Amino acid sequence: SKRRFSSEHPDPVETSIPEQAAEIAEELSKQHPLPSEEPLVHHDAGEFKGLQRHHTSAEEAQKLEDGKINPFTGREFTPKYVDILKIRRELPVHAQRDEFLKLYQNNQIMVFVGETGSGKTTQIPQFVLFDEMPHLENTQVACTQPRRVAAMSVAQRVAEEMDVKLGEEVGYSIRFENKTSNKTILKYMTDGMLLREAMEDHDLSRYSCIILDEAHERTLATDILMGLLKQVVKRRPDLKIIIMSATLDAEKFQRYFNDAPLLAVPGRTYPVELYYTPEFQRDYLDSAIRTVLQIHATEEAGDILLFLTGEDEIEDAVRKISLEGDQLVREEGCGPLSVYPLYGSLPPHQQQRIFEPAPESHNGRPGRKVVISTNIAETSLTIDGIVYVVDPGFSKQKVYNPRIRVESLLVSPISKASAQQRAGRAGRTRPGKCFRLYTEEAFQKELIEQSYPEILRSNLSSTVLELKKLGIDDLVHFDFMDPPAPETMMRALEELNYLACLDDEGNLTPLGRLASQFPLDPMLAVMLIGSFEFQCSQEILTIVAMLSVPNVFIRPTKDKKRADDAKNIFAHPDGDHITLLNVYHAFKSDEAYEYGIHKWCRDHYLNYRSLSAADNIRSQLERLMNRYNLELNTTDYESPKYFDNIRKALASGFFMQVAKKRSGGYITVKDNQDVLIHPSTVLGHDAEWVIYNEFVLTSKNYIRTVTSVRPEWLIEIAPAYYDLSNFQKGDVKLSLERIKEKVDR
Ligand SMILES: Nc1ccn([C@@H]2O[C@H](COP(=O)(O)OP(=O)(O)O)[C@@H](O)[C@H]2O)c(=O)n1
Ligand SMILES: [Mg+2]
Ligand code: NI
């Protein structure tokens, strides 16, 4: 039965200021509807006309590959393309090309498996390109990666293998980063971005083929896509699906996909000699740095791959190994050593540096390359020439606390499966070694078998809003390969209801529809959309962007005081959200430009990469707001309302993340949890009530990135949530009781 709404228990949708803005912006759009997406263009000079769709063979394709003229363009192949072509034809998948094609042609859905390095991601989409000829039938081919870096990098690679401009025929699409055009045939993308394209077009009519790659990682977006496409095939007989996975046990995938056929590529990997440590290593970084240097000194030629858990850690490791590395060249006469980082946030031109050849030695002692990388180097891509792996046995993983309902990112021990995959990378070129910084005992006993799929480790808030935009009604019976606890799904509906993205009946509100057009956490989108109603859109727009990137402040452990002093320039007391607005404003100042920008960031102890990212994110966000008719406005700084309005917008999205100061530490509105402010910030005596961006649990529980807020404002902005009937007795409800009555006449 329909829920009743009163002044005592209002409708969260009607009381949502963001909802108002959405309704306003929605109508502005109806005065000028948007044009339909720009069409695709291609080239036919008749190069393919000798080929018949879904009847093609490997030989028929070779002749075209071996022809003068690039069939997809009409221009002629470059001499480097021919060199590359010989190399890539030595990959294992090329032996099975006709076997693969025969399955592609006779089936809608198929499973593909092979060791990392078999040539799945780079080749198979090109195989499909020749048999499908999607540009002739006015379609594309999509290939999804769980990882940003894997998508961008491999797209750069395959563009060269097809001898085409990046962004023209071969292109890539990432969140806030897009290289594509009307010319694009083969599009490598993150599984998240394909999911978003599906939200706008449910049938994905632009793609005659969809390749879900690296399924074994079983990321949240991949699992959803598998669920969708399993339906789409019914509406679309003209669509073909390929599921690629690195694990040879795919039987579960076959059943889920309705007993689809399996193609397996046999392992070509060489033997890898495993080395363990005699006892537990408490500090693995120094253990790792030493192992690398040991190898470079004592071992025969070949390149080293080091697995670490994050950028700051990796950049720190690049520093030390570069330093001690240069010392051995000078002191001990070692061969030269090159050192490259790899992690998620890296720019593309920095990404591609890992493939550079090892330096040539003049000392008669081998020159070498060491790549310090995250789990990206586990299955997602391969670096030619790696004979040596160093495995500290840690990765940055998402954990979930269903009781508290909180997502945390923590460095934690890897699965046994991951350890095997890491070691396997040393045996590609020839026999090689893998040095594990744990004990053979720990590897068998302590490490777990496999990591649970992300769907089980996530809060489903964004997942739910995505599903509803896709037209899914019953979210419990949705076809997930591994269903989440239904309790988690029900919580997400509540939260999105309070955010006024959904009504009490579960239907999308105008806010929800608009919020889904932004690639942000629902809290961030709501905050951003309703921002102009609080007359600070320009400032909130900046703050969302800053929140979309890592902490920009650099605080070396030895240099702490100077770094803190540098930060207090931008620091706003009880303003951590406002601090973010200050650095970005400082970052874009004409003053920092004259100073020189990279030097400015370094001297002020700020990270240029993070701030550069935010700048791009902000631009991409501003573009969405102009498109969907969200007004850009700002209040004069001298105004008494200036900081109030920002705090109001912030509360509008984040009102469910709030804490009140203990009378007799802090208590959180939701769940009534005792917490402490993160040491990274101190608060004055005037902040009884604060909004926090982050819940951080290490032993004791912290809230980070905090900004004070007046509890009155909470009642005004979110009256449905702060309805006292929802609260249980405690310091929190009593205090709330008193703010209510004190509103008089
Ligand atoms: N991002 C990438 C991925 C692969 N490659 C090259 O392409 C070969 C591996 O092909 P692949 O990535 O398609 O193999 P799979 O892991 O997909 O099965 C290797 O010889 C790599 O050197 C590259 O240069 N850059
Ligand atoms: Mg691959
Ligand atoms: Ni049921």
Features:
monomer, 745 residues, alpha/beta, Rossmann fold, 4 domains, 21 strands, globular, binds cytidine-5'-diphosphate, binds nickel (II) ion, RNA binding, phosphoprotein, ATP hydrolysis activity, RNA helicase activity, DHX15_DEXHc
What does this structure look like?
The protein is an alpha/beta fold and 745 residues long. The chain has 4 domains: 1-36 and 499-745, no CATH class; 37-268, P-loop containing nucleotide triphosphate hydrolases (Rossmann fold, 3-Layer(aba) Sandwich), CATH 3.40.50; 269-451, 3-Layer(aba) Sandwich (Rossmann fold); 452-498, DEAH helicase family, winged-helix domain (Arc Repressor Mutant, subunit A, Orthogonal Bundle), CATH 1.10.10.2130. The chain is 39% helix and 16% strand. The chain has an 8-stranded mixed beta sheet with strand order 4-3-5-2-6-7-1-8, with helices on both faces. Strands 9-16-13-10-12-11 form a 6-stranded parallel beta sheet, sandwiched between helices. A hairpin with a 2-residue loop joins strand 3 (170-174) and strand 4 (177-179). The two termini are 36 Å apart. Cytidine-5'-diphosphate is lined by residues 114, 116-123, 153-154, 157, 355, 381-382, 384. Component of the NTR complex (NTC-related complex), composed of NTR1, NTR2 and PRP43. Interacts with NTR1 and NTR2. Interacts with SPP382. It catalyses: ATP + H2O = ADP + phosphate + H(+). A motif (DEAH box) lies at residues 213-216.
**Molecules bound to protein:** cytidine-5'-diphosphate, magnesium ion, nickel (II) ion
Span of the ends, CA to CA: 36 Å
* Portion in strands: 15-25%
How many domains is the backbone divided into?
Answer: 4
Region (Disordered): 1-72
Motif (DEAH box): 213-216
Catalytic activity: ATP + H2O = ADP + phosphate + H(+)
Domain Helicase ATP-binding: 101-266
